[PDB]
Amino acid sequence: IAVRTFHDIRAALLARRELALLDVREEDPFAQAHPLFAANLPLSRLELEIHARVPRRDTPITVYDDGEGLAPVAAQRLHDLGYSDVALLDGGLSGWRNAGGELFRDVNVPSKAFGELVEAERHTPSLAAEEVQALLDARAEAVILDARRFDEYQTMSIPGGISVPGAELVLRVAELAPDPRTRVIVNCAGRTRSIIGTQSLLNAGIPNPVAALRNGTIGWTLAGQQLEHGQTRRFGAISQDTRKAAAQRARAVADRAGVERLDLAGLAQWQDEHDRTTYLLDVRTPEEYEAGHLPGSRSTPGGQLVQETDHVASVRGARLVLVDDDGVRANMSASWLAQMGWQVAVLDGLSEADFSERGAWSAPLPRQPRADTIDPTTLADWLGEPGTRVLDFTASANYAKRHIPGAAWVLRSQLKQALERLGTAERYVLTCGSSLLARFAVAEVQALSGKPVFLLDGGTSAWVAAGLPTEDGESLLASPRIDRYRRPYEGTDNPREAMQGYLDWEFGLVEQLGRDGTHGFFVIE
Ligand SMILES: O=S([O-])[O-]
């Protein structure tokens, strides 16, 4: 395990050499401060995502934390998983700060900062919440398209809004706003996806007057206006005429942004070059993906690939190949990734036969460690007497929703502390949604406790499937709930102060990008 400094990372970013800068702390602390291109991969779930986010075993990986002692453990596990070029960031987070490195809060910062850059450079049109409300009061001919995931749209939405995820905008707009006089308004929860969506439509050159709802659902609430909930308005299937026209416009945008082209043979060649990381991504809807997709491809709906790029393409400097079956979605998404400095190509010449693999994406995993298992009914019997400690590794949010009675929620990254707090037990039984994450924790629990440790066969899902009783709420938390950053732009229970604070934070991103100076972003037109 070597050591790499802020300067080593900065040099690689400027030269655009592949690298993976991983913050191994939990998400909440990550969200308080981290380098622009640092990807968050909590030590707690390192093994579950590393092979997908950093596929090249010899990729220069640099892990860090802020002194918790998580980094050295992460480095060792990576070595044992087969990664040959692992290092610790000199001084950790503080080392980066002390060297003069720029630090950012929140999540998916490159994507959000880029969004602000687009508006700053192209002056992307926007309408105040009050102006849009007036249009509604005037029964104006206008459609409001929500560019977020369908589940976000269902949580809360702008009155009359229609769900049209980011990458679907250029493809579906002609069917939702056929009259060129019809105004098209794009919204999200905050600003990012609304800016990208509005500019996507302008870049594609639609005849309709377009504008982003300024500050989205957050702005709607701050304006004292009313949101709807549980809505189901959504885009529909389009005609071939609509598709062909939009595809021509999209391809032009992609060519303009420098998006590369590839055919199946070209793809195979890239995957044959072991000196580069190549992510094969399907930008269509989840439903289409599961109905049939290219072998080796991962499902990353376009709008979200552009919004949460670091969750998938964690190796900055890597190569991306996008898949779609319409000629619009991949081209548009690629144009944005190109502007965010990514080397990206769109896969051409695909036929219906190429989408042969079916079902949900199966993430690549390392060898599964061995463990002695116990059936749900046996565990129930054990719990009839004291002495059995059940540890739940699922996300704290999931735990609060439903868990095995008496189970203690824990952070895999803080097991020593959790076990001390819980006292002693005659035996431990580990669980999680399916038992997958808990299985990777067996060895550590055995080491720290020196007690018999078992894995619940099938996890909590199996327990529930057995008809056994469950308990909800924060029954017993043996670790602090820092596994998830409370995004001010998700849900409707965030205080107005936090929501306005989120907008203020985005307002300062372009200035921060200037101070960082390693992004290489550019905005076409
Ligand atoms: O992309 S929006 O929800 O901030």
TrEMBL record:
Keywords tagged on the record: Repeat
Pfam families documented for this protein: Rhodanese
Ranges of residues in domain Rhodanese: 15-105, 138-229, 274-472
InterPro entries associated with the record: Rhodanese-like_dom (IPR001763), Rhodanese-like_dom_sf (IPR036873), Thiosulfate_sulfurtransferase (IPR051126), Thiosulphate_STrfase_CS (IPR001307)
GO molecular function list: thiosulfate-cyanide sulfurtransferase activity
Top-rank lineage group of the source organism: Bacteria
Stated name of the protein: Probable thiosulfate sulfurtransferase
Organism in which the protein naturally occurs: Pseudomonas aeruginosa (strain ATCC 15692 / DSM 22644 / CIP 104116 / JCM 14847 / LMG 12228 / 1C / PRS 101 / PAO1)
